[PDB]
């Protein structure tokens, strides 16, 4: 503490230099069924970008190891969380968005990006937590005659708000003259058909994009990474992993009871004073292992 070999006479309060926790415990809810990756990624058909499809995912085990042989991903980007930590985390509200876009429009699927897809088809919130996954789909989405099934909205009066979908087919009049349907000189049908071909360039080749949006620590999580649970340890300083929340603390039974919507409790300092065990609905108080207070009186 003094950063000196020689010490004079003093009370000398000293900072702690000792190790306390040697036990690590993981508490995760009971989930047996694997996440439906095959339905989400390996699907015979995908929605058009303007009519993007949203699928709720719940009560699933998020193991991405299964997809390693089956699928190869051209683009994988996670904004809210680091990709390595996904296995140790639980996702409270995961939603999967599936659509097909041109190969060079994959860049547009990012927060703050601008372009035809970003402005009039799919919009991402600036504060986006989740991962965007894209892969080439030329074999399944392209035909020798050509695939014109996929559609995108070329013209719209205003830019789309984040996570907003419009399927309106109403004629757009660039000119002042009222359109009254009847596409004409200044009136154009808003949707434009894509033209995917097997021999077409990679930029024009079809790409399937899946966007995952989720919150992790906040809220009860029915979706969790593949970590085995361990027996609860209480009244000892232990490292704990409750629903992807990692901390070192003493665990004790808690008199305070959370409301059903509430999953965890935070004190004035904003640290997690109380937590609810995932498997059993018992509130557990979290207490710092160290209490402090040491001084060395030395001649």
């Amino acid at each position: 503490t003094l950063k000196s070999l020689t010490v004079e006479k003093g009370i000398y309060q000293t900072s702690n230099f000792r190790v306390q926790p040697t036990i690590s415990i993981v508490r995760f809810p009971n989930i047996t069924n694997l996440c439906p990756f095959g339905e989400v990624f390996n699907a015979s058909k995908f929605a058009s970008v303007y009519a993007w499809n949203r699928k709720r995912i719940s009560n699933c085990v998020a193991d991405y190891s299964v997809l390693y042989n089956s699928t190869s991903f051209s683009t994988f980007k996670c904004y809210g969380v680091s990709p390595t930590k996904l296995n140790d985390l639980c996702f409270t509200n995961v939603y999967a968005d599936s659509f097909v876009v041109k190969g060079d429009e994959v860049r547009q699927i990012a927060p703050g990006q601008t372009g035809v897809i970003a402005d009039y088809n799919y919009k991402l919130p600036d504060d986006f937590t989740g991962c965007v996954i894209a892969w080439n789909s030329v074999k399944q989405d392209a035909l020798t005659g050509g695939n014109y099934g996929y559609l995108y909205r070329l013209f719209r009066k205003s830019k789309l708000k984040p996570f907003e979908r419009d399927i309106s087919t109403e004629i757009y009049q660039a000119g002042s003259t009222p359109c009254n349907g009847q596409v004409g000189l200044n009136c154009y049908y808003p949707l434009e058909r894509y033209g995917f071909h097997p021999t077409t360039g990679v930029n024009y080749q079809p790409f399937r994009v899946v966007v995952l949006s989720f919150e992790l620590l906040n809220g009860p999580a029915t979706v969790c990474g593949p970590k085995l649970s361990t027996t609860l340890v209480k009244d000892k300083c232990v490292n704990f992993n409750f629903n992807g929340l990692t901390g070192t603390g003493v665990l004790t039974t808690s008199k305070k009871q959370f409301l059903p919507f509430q999953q965890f409790g935070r004190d004035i300092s904003d640290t997690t004073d109380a937590v609810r065990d995932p498997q059993t609905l018992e509130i557990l108080d979290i207490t710092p292992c160290s209490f402090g207070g040491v001084s060395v009186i030395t001649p």
């Binding site: 906040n218 305070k256 409301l259 509430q262 999953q263 965890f264 935070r266 004190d267």
Partner: peptide
């Protein structure tokens, strides 16, 4: 209405 699902007591 409650802003968040976080539990706060006597604060």
């Amino acid at each position: 209405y409650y802003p968040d699902k976080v539990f706060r007591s006597s604060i």
